[PDB]
Amino acid sequence: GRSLELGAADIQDLESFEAGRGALPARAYLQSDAPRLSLNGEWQFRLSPGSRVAPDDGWQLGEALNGFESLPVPSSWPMHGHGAPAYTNVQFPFAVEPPHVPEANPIGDHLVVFEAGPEFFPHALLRFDGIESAGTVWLNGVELGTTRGSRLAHEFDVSGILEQGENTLAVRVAQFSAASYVEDQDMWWLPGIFRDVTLQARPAAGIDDVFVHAGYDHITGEGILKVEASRGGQAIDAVVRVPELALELAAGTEVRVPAVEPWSAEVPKLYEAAVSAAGESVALQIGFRSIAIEDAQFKVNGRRILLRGVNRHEHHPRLGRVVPRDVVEAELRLMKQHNINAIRTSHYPPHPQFLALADQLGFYVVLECDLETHGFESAGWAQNPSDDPQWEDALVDRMRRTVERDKNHASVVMWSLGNEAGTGRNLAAMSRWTKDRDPSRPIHYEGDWSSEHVDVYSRMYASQAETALIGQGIEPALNDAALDARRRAMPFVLCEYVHAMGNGPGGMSEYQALFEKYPRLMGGFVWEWLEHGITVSTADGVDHYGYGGDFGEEVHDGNFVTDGLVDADRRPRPGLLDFKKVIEPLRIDVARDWTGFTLRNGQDFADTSAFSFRYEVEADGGALDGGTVDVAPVAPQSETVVELPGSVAALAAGLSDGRPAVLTVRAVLGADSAWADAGHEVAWGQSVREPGAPVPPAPVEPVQVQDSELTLGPVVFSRATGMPTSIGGVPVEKLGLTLWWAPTDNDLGREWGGADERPLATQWKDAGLNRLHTRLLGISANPGQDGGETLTVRTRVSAADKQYGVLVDYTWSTDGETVGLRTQVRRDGTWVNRGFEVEWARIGLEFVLGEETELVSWFGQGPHQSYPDTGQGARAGWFSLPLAKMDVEYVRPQECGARSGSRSAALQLGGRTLEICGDPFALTVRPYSQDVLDAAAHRPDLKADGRTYLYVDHALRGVGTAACGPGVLEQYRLKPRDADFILTLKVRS
Amino acid sequence: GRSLELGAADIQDLESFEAGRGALPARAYLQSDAPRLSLNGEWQFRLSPGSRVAPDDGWQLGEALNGFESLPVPSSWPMHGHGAPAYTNVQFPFAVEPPHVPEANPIGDHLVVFEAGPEFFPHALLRFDGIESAGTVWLNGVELGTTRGSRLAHEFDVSGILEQGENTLAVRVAQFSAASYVEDQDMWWLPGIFRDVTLQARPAAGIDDVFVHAGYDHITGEGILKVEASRGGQAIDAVVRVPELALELAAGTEVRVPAVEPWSAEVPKLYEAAVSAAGESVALQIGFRSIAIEDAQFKVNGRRILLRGVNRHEHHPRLGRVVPRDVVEAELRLMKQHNINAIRTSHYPPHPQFLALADQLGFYVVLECDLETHGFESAGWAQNPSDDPQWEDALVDRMRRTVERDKNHASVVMWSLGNEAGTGRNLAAMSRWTKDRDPSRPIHYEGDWSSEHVDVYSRMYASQAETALIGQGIEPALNDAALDARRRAMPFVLCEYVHAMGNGPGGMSEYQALFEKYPRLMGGFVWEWLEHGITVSTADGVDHYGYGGDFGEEVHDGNFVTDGLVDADRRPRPGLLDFKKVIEPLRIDVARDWTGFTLRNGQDFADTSAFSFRYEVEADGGALDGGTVDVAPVAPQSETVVELPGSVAALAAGLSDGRPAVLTVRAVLGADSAWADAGHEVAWGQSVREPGAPVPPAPVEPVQVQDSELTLGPVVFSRATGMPTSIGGVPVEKLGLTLWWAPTDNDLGREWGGADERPLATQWKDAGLNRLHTRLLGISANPGQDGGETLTVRTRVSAADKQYGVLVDYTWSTDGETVGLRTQVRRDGTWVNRGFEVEWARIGLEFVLGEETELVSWFGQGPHQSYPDTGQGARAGWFSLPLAKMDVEYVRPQECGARSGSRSAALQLGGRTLEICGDPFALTVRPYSQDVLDAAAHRPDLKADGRTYLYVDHALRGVGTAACGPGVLEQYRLKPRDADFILTLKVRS
Numbered sequence A, B: 001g002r003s004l005e006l007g008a009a010d011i012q013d014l015e016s017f018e019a020g021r022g023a024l025p026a027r028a029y030l031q032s033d034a035p036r037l038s039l040n041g042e043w044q045f046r047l048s049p050g051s052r053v054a055p056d057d058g059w060q061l062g063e064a065l066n067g068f069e070s071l072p073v074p075s076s077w078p079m080h081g082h083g084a085p086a087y088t089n090v091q092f093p094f095a096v097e098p099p100h101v102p103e104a105n106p107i108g109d110h111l112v113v114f115e116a117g118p119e120f121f122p123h124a125l126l127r128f129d130g131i132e133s134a135g136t137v138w139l140n141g142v143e144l145g146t147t148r149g150s151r152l153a154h155e156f157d158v159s160g161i162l163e164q165g166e167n168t169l170a171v172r173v174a175q176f177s178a179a180s181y182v183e184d185q186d187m188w189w190l191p192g193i194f195r196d197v198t199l200q201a202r203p204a205a206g207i208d209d210v211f212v213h214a215g216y217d218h219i220t221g222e223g224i225l226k227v228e229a230s231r232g233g234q235a236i237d238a239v240v241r242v243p244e245l246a247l248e249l250a251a252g253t254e255v256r257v258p259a260v261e262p263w264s265a266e267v268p269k270l271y272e273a274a275v276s277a278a279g280e281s282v283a284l285q286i287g288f289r290s291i292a293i294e295d296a297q298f299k300v301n302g303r304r305i306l307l308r309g310v311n312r313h314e315h316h317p318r319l320g321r322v323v324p325r326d327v328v329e330a331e332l333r334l335m336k337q338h339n340i341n342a343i344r345t346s347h348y349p350p351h352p353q354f355l356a357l358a359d360q361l362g363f364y365v366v367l368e369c370d371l372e373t374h375g376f377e378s379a380g381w382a383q384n385p386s387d388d389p390q391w392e393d394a395l396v397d398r399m400r401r402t403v404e405r406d407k408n409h410a411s412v413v414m415w416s417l418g419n420e421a422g423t424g425r426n427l428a429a430m431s432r433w434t435k436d437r438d439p440s441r442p443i444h445y446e447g448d449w450s451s452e453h454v455d456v457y458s459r460m461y462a463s464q465a466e467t468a469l470i471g472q473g474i475e476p477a478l479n480d481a482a483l484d485a486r487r488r489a490m491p492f493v494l495c496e497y498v499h500a501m502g503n504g505p506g507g508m509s510e511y512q513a514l515f516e517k518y519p520r521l522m523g524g525f526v527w528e529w530l531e532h533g534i535t536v537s538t539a540d541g542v543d544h545y546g547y548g549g550d551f552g553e554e555v556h557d558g559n560f561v562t563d564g565l566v567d568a569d570r571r572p573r574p575g576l577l578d579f580k581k582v583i584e585p586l587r588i589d590v591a592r593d594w595t596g597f598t599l600r601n602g603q604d605f606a607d608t609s610a611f612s613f614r615y616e617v618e619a620d621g622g623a624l625d626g627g628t629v630d631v632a633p634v635a636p637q638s639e640t641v642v643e644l645p646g647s648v649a650a651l652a653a654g655l656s657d658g659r660p661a662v663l664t665v666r667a668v669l670g671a672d673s674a675w676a677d678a679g680h681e682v683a684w685g686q687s688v689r690e691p692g693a694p695v696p697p698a699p700v701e702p703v704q705v706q707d708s709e710l711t712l713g714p715v716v717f718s719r720a721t722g723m724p725t726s727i728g729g730v731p732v733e734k735l736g737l738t739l740w741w742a743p744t745d746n747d748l749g750r751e752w753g754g755a756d757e758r759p760l761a762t763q764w765k766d767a768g769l770n771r772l773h774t775r776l777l778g779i780s781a782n783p784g785q786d787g788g789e790t791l792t793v794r795t796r797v798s799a800a801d802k803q804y805g806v807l808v809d810y811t812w813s814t815d816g817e818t819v820g821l822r823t824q825v826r827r828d829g830t831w832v833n834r835g836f837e838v839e840w841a842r843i844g845l846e847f848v849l850g851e852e853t854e855l856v857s858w859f860g861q862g863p864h865q866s867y868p869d870t871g872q873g874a875r876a877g878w879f880s881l882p883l884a885k886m887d888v889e890y891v892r893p894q895e896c897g898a899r900s901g902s903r904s905a906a907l908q909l910g911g912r913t914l915e916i917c918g919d920p921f922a923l924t925v926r927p928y929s930q931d932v933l934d935a936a937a938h939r940p941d942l943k944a945d946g947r948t949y950l951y952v953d954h955a956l957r958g959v960g961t962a963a964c965g966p967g968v969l970e971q972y973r974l975k976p977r978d979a980d981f982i983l984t985l986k987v988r989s
C-alpha cells in the first residue's frame, strides 16, 4: 500500500532541519561598482492555503498563469489583502511538534519577468535580502535553491541559467516551516518577500567579500587598519585607498595610521575608503574604534560608555516588515533628537542598509541573530531547538550569515546570539563560531544567566533593586565557582527594561541613577522603540490602530504588540518625552538663588563645545529676561559651576513674595548637526519661585435656604443631595470623591510576588473602587464672619457589599466671587478585600459639568502628562491646550492625560472661564466619563457626551511597569489614608 | 446651625432596628365566618427614587393625585415597568453599613378607595400578608403603623378610623430598609405589596387566635387532641366539634380520641373541625401526627421517615413574588407526580394559603423564618445582625410571626430559624422562644454547625463522603464535649444538596444509597425547585428567560438564580426526571431470566395496595407481550419476590441471540389520587437483552484513486485532508476528534481543593481543548479480502502552542452498502498544562453534515438526556424525536442533549437516512456548532446554519454539581487515555 496523501514532498522540505540549499557562501553586504538590477516592483502573486493544494501547474515558466494577480515586492503579503496579520507574543500559533508544520500553511507563489543585458554575463547572481519563512527559487524553470533565515540574505549563482534578454524569476514562499520554531519573536507573523531582490553581475577579477579591521589605540592616537579581501573564498590581491588619511596599502596587511579621529556614537567620524581589484571596486566607510572589557566595564576607545538605547523592531503600520528608507532615516533622526545613542536590533538583523545609517548618525548597535525559541519555555524547554543537535547546522548558519553581512560596520559593538532561546549546545556552537570568526566584538545573549558562552552579563526587566546589587558586584554567586568568577568580571547590560506599554513607563529615573553611579552597569535598552500598530478603517472610514485579535486570530496576545515609545507612525508617546530627559547627556542644576547653575558633562568623549547655553526667566506676563552665557568647554565626566548674569539673580531677589516665576537654563545645539538643526534642545534645568498658597475667601456671604435648593454666593446646591448643581452659572451635573482610574496596561499585568497576584485592575474591580456610592449624612450651615456662613456637607463613600468606606466632608465658603472648598477624607473601617489590603489609584474629586470645554490652561508641569513616577520631561511653566490635545491617543484607551504638580487651572467653557486654584494637585479634563474610557478597546469607542469631566486629585499613585517588569515602586504606592485639601474656585465673564 | 437635609425623618424610620409599630399581636391565619373584604385589585401608584424626594403632598387623602397611575395589588412593582428587577446571590446591592440605607431607594406610594358596609362595624382590621420591605399604612389620613418582615403578616385595628361607606387606604413602601440587611436571600430584589390586602370584621365574642394540638399514639392508635382558643390575648370558652370522630369538646382541654387515622405525607388524613364562640366560628383541618427524635432518628408517628424534598422559592416569571394560586396547586401536583414528599420554604414563610395545600396533598414541610444575613460573611461576620443585641426584638418578632401564622398545620414538621445568618445571640433567642411556644416541632438551622440551639444536625452541599461518615456517626467531634454529645444524638438532614444548576445534577444516586442505608440520615432537599427566570422579549418579539445582569444591574450574579429542577413556567428540566427515579418509593429489580422481579416497598407507612404492577416486553417491531400481575400487599420497609407470567420468561428464552428486547415492569396508581390520575407511573425496573455487537462489513470493495479524491464504496474522501466529503450522497463538511464540550454551569464553578482551583472550563480554555487542530500524517490503502482494501488515515490532533497531542487513525472498510470505521486514539506526550493534568470532556467524533436533520431515532437510553452520573430517569427502549426536541432549553445555552448508552441511531436527512451502529456510544445531534453553543448567553443567540452536527462519543465525563457543592465524582472523571472503538455507517433510500 503506497502513500496516497498529496504534497508530501513539499511538506518534507518545509520540515527540513537544514539551512537553505544551493546558495553561495555568506558574505558582507558591500557597495560595489559592479552592475546591478533591482527586480523590485509589481510582481505576480497567487495564494494557496496549504502545500497539498498548492498547484503544480508549471507556473514557474510564467505561461498561462491561472489565478495570479499583481502584488508589490518587497511586501508582507497579509498587508495587501491576502490573508491577514496574526499576532502572538510567546505562544506559537501552531501545535508545537517540531519540525512539523500545520495543514493551514499559506503558500505564496511569486513571479516576475525581467530583462538582463550583456553586462550581466557571463557571471551574475540573484540576491534575496529577506523571505519569511521558507522560499524556493526558480529561474527560467531551473531550481536555484531554498532560503532559511527569514531576515538573512541569500545569493544564488545564475551563471548559465540567466539568459540574455527576457528571464522569468519564480519564488514559492511558505509562511510556516521548521524555521518557524526558531523565529518566535513577539511580533506580527507576516510572510512574504519583504526585502530587496537584486540581480548583480560578478565580473572576473572582482571582490566577493571584504572584512574591515579598524582599531584605535587611545594612548597613542593611532589607527590600526587591516582590510581583508577575497574572491571565491580565497584572499586576493587588492589595493586599499583612504584618501583623507593619505595612505595606499595592500589588502591583507595590518598597518598603523599615526593619528586618526576615533569613531563613537557621540562623534561618528567616518573615513571614506575604496578597496579595488582589476574587475571590481568596493566603497567603504571606516570608523576607527576598539572595544574592550576590563575591570568589569564595557569600554570603547579606552573609556567606559553609557548605553542610552532602545529595542528597534522593523514594522510599518501599512507595509508590515517593509520599512521605507525615508521612515528609517526619519526615525533614527528622531532617536538622536531624544538623546538615544544605542540600538538593539530586536530580534533579528535589520535591513542591510540600516547599518550605514547607524555608522553615520552614531549609534552603539547590538546586532542580533535571527533566533528565538520562546514558545518552548512553557514545556520546560523540552524539544528546544537550541539544544537539539539536529538544529546545529541551521543555527550556526543563522549566526554565520548574521556576522558576515554586517562585520564591516563600526556601529556594531556587540554580536547577540538571539533572544529568549533558552540554553543549549547549539547556542554554544554559535558563540564559538563568532568568537573565532570575529574576536573584535563581545558576544551578548541574555537567555543563559550563567553567561558561560558570552562576554557581558545581560538581563531583561531586572528590578532596580537587583540592578543596584549587580552594579556593586554583590549579587548571589553562581553554583559553579569558575562560571561565577567569569561573570563577576563581566559588565552588566539590561537588553530590555522599563517596558513602555501604554501609560508609562515609570521608574526610569531610579535605573538611570544606578547607571551613572556604578561603572559595571553599561546601561539599558528600552522595550520598545515603536508600537506595532496596524492601520485599520472603521465602518465610517475613520483610521485607528489595530492589535492582536483585531484580525480574526484564533490565538493572540491582544495589545501587547503596541508597547512602544512612539506609535507605528513614529508619533512620540509621553514616555519618549520623559525618556529623553532621563537620559539627557548633560545635567544642569540651577541654583536656588538664581546666581548660576552646576553643569555636569555626562558624555563619554565629547566636551560641551557643541552646545549653546541659554537662560530665560518667565512669569505670568511672559518672558522677563533671557540670553546666552559663555561656558568654557567642560571635559567629559567633569563638571563646573557657571555664573549667570547678575540681572537674573537681581530679578529673583526683587520678586514680591508669592509671585510665580521660572528660571530655565537650556543646552541647545549651537550649529546644525546631521540629526537636528541648531537650537535643538538637548538638556535643561529649572528653578521655580512657587506661587504662595491660595488665600481662602472670607466667609461673608450667607446661605440662602429654599425648599429644594440652597444658594451660597455663586453656588447653587441641591438640598436633596447636598452637592452643587451650579457654580457661577456653570451647570454642575455631579461632584463626588474618586479613588479609581481606568486601568492602564500596567494595571492589567500581574503583581508578581506575595500571596496576591491578581492584577491591580482586578483588585480594584473586586473591591468595588470603580462603582463607588455616596450616602448623605447631613447638611448644616455654620457662622462665618460679618453675617456670612459656611456650608458643611457630610457624606460617606463606599461600595455595594463592602463594609469599608471613607467619610468625606465638604466645607464651602464664599465672599461673593471666590468659592472656598475644603475636603476632608477619613477612613471608616479597614480597607481589606479578599484578605488583601486595597490600594487606591488616587484621592481626588470629579466635577461633571453640563457644558463642553474648549480650552484648558494651567500653571505647573507640562505640556504633556505627568504621574508620580513619570513626567520627567514635563517642565515647570504656563501651558494652554485645546481639550482634544490634553488626551493621549493610546491604541487601547486607558487612564492618561493627568497633569501632576498643578497650582492653578483654567477651563474655558464657552464664554465663561472656570478657575481652580489650590495646593499642588493633578489636573485632568475629558469629554467622556471614566467608564466610557475603561470600556473602550479602541479609540473610536470614545465619544463625547456634551459634558466636561474635570478631575482634581490631591494624590495619585504611580504607573510603574507591571505589564512586564517591576510594578509601582514603594515610594509611589497609594495606600488608604486620611487626607484634607483645600481648593478655591471662580467663574468669570 | 440646624440641619438642612431633606427627608431625615422618613430615613430615620427606615433605619429603625425595631419591628413594625402599631400592629395587633401576631396570630394564626384562620378561616373564619367573620365578614371579609379583599382590597385586591387596581390601585393607584406613584414611584419616587428616594425618601428625600418622596413628595409630602397630602397624597394619603386621595385628592388631587399628582403622578399616580394604575397598578395591580398584590404585585412586585418592578415586574410592571416601574424600575427593574435586580438579582444578587450573596452580595448586598448596597454598601454594608447597617442600619443605614442608600440614597437610591425606590419609594412606592400605593393608594386605593374602597367601600365598607355596616358588617365591618364597630370593629374591623386591615391585614397585610406581605410588603417588601418597609411599609407605612394610613387609613383616611390616620397613620395605622408600619410593617417589618417582608414575607410576614401584619394586622392593624381600624376601629374608630374606618368610616362607613367610602374609605381611603394609603401605603408608602420603601424597597430598602434596615430590614434589607436581614433579608439577603439568593433571589430577585422585588419591592411591593405582593400579598393579599384584606379588610376583616372582628365581631364581639369572637375568636382571634387558635392553637391546634393533634398528637398520635402509635402504640394505642389514639389521637391526642387539644384546641386552644383566645380573644384579646385571653383563653376563652369555645366549643370544638369534629363530626367525623363523633366528639364535641371544650377548647382548652386535652382529650384522647380512641382511634384516629394518622396524618403523613404518604397518607394526609385530615379531619374537618370547627371551633366556635358566640360571635365567630373557625374552620380547621386536623391531622393527627406526632414528631419525635430518638436513637438519633427523625421519627413521625413512631417511624423514621425519609425526606424526598425540594427547596421551594416563590417566584413567577411575569409577576415576581406573586404566585397565582392555580400555579401553586399545579406545581405541588407536579411535585407529587415526581415522588417528592417534602418542601423547605426557602427562605421565608410562603403565602398563608400554601399550608392548607401542603396538609391536603401531603408534604413534610420545613417552614423557615424570614431571616438571612449572608452578605455579612465576606467581612468575617462583623456587624452580623444575628449577634447584635440591637436586632434581638426585630429577629424574635420575625420568628414569632412565623410560628404564630402557621402553628396549626400538620404538614409543618420543623421550624427553621432562617438561612445563612451566621451564629449569634439573637438566633439563640429565636430558638428559646420557639421551643417554649411550640415544643411539638423540632427546630432547624444550618448556620451554626455546633447545633447548640437546634434539634437536628443540618448541612448544605456536604459531599457524599462526609454524608457517609455522618450517617455512621463517626464524623469528627466538636471541641465542646457537651455540644458534641448533643449533636451525635441528632439525626442529620441536608437542607440543600445536589445543586440542580443547568446540565445536572450529577451524583444524586450516591446520596440516595446513603439515605437508604443509614437511619440517622433524614434525607435531603434539592436546591432548587424552580428557576427564577423572568420572561423577556427580544427586539423581534420572541420570548426568552432573563437572569442577573439582563436588567442593567450594577452588581449581580448572572444566571445563578436559574438553578432549578423546573423552569420558571414549571416545565421540567431533565434533572427532575432523574430526581423522580432516584427517589422512587418502590424499588423493582427485574430478574435477568425474566421469571419475576424483586419488589421493595420503600415507603414509611403505606403498603403497596394503591399500586398496579404492569409488565411489557418490547422489541424492534413493538410490544410482544404485556399485562398485569397481582401482588399481595407488601408492608412498608419489607420486600417480596413477584413471579411473572410464564409467557414472559418463555419469550426471553426463545429470542434469537443478538435480537434486542426490553422487559419493563412498572408500578402505577391503580386509581385516581388527589395529585395524579390512575395509571400515573411511580416506579419502574427493566431487564434488557442487548443487541449483539455489530459485525464489521467485509472489506470486498477497493479504493478507487483520482487526483483530488478517493472513493471507497459509498464514501468519497478528500485526498488532501484524508477526511470523507460524502457518505452515500450525504455531504460531509468535516470529521474530526472531539475532547471538549461547551462548558456547563457546573464546569464554570471552581474545583475547590488542591493547588488548582481554576474552573474546569478555564482549565480547558488554557489547555486549548476548544481549539484543536489536526495534522495529516499519511494515507494508505491495505489489502482487504477478495480484491477489496481498507483505507487508513493517520492524523495527530493537538492545539496551538502545546506539545501534547493524540494520534488518531481512521481505518475505513466497506462491502458496498455498509461502511466500517475503526478509530484508534493514542496519547503523544504528557497532557499537562500550567503544571496540572488536563482532563477531557469526552472521547468522540464530530460529523458536520451539509444538510439539515429533521428526525433523530435511536435505541438506548431515553427519551431525555443522560450523562455518566445522570440519566437515571432515561430507560432502555426505542426513541424518536424531531431535532428541536433533542435539545434542552437551558436559559444559558450549554452542553446538553447527549443520549448515553446508545447502540444504534438513525438521522433522517431529508429523503435519506443515516444509520450509525456500534458498541455503546453517546449520541448528540444539533443544528449549530459547539462554538455557537458556548458563545450563546441566551437561547435566541442559537441559530441554525443549515448543517447537522452529529456527535458520537466513545467516552464522556460526568457533569457533577461543581457550580455549588461536589464536583464530578472520581468514578466519572475522564483522564487522558488510549482508546479504540468501532462504528458502522449506512445511508438508505
Ligand SMILES: OC[C@H]1O[C@@H](O)[C@H](O)[C@@H](O)[C@H]1O
Pocket (backbone or CB within 6 Å): A089, A186, A346, A419, A420, A496, A527, A964
Ligand atoms: O514579556 C515578554 C518580553 O520578552 C522579550 O524577550 C520580548 O522581546 C518582549 O515581548 C518582552 O515583552
Ligand SMILES: OC[C@H]1O[C@@H](O)[C@H](O)[C@@H](O)[C@H]1O
Pocket (backbone or CB within 6 Å): B089, B186, B346, B419, B420, B496, B527, B964
Ligand atoms: O451557593 C450559595 C448557596 O447558599 C444557599 O444558602 C442559598 O440558598 C443558595 O443560593 C445556594 O446556592
Ligand code: NA
Pocket (backbone or CB within 6 Å): A011, A014, A050, A051, A052, A101, A102, A103, A105, A174
Ligand atoms: Na504546508
Ligand code: NA
Pocket (backbone or CB within 6 Å): A501, A502, A503, A559, A562, A563, A564, A745, A890, A891, A892
Ligand atoms: Na499601549
Ligand code: NA
Pocket (backbone or CB within 6 Å): A186, A560, A561, A562, A563
Ligand atoms: Na510586546
Ligand code: NA
Pocket (backbone or CB within 6 Å): B011, B014, B050, B051, B052, B101, B102, B103, B105, B174
Ligand atoms: Na430612602
Ligand code: NA
Pocket (backbone or CB within 6 Å): B501, B502, B503, B559, B562, B563, B564, B745, B890, B891, B892
Ligand atoms: Na441553568
Ligand code: NA
Pocket (backbone or CB within 6 Å): B186, B560, B561, B562, B563
Ligand atoms: Na441560586
